Amino acid sequence: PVIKVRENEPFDVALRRFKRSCEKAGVLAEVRRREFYEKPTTERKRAKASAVKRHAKKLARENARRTRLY
Template structure:
């Protein structure tokens, strides 16, 4: 779980922006969305293969 320390006299909006950036860099939301529903192993392999083809 990413965490940040709010500095003295730091506006709340800036702290939220830093936290959002940290969460995005760690890929936490992407992982949560991927694990939201069960994905069959065959569907997972198919998705990963399609992503590999798309990358090339």
């Protein structure tokens, strides 16, 4: 939840970025699921896959930006 800290009562510094025990934490990898030989890299390629108009628009911005012809 709170980790350990050199800090003076951190509660007004909006830290969450490391401040877990299981919640987006590294020990969640064997907690509450099967072994999955393929899943954990498959589920990256799948998550990324649908937002392709927004993807391609940044790519096009960068190709049009990069050439110094404007």
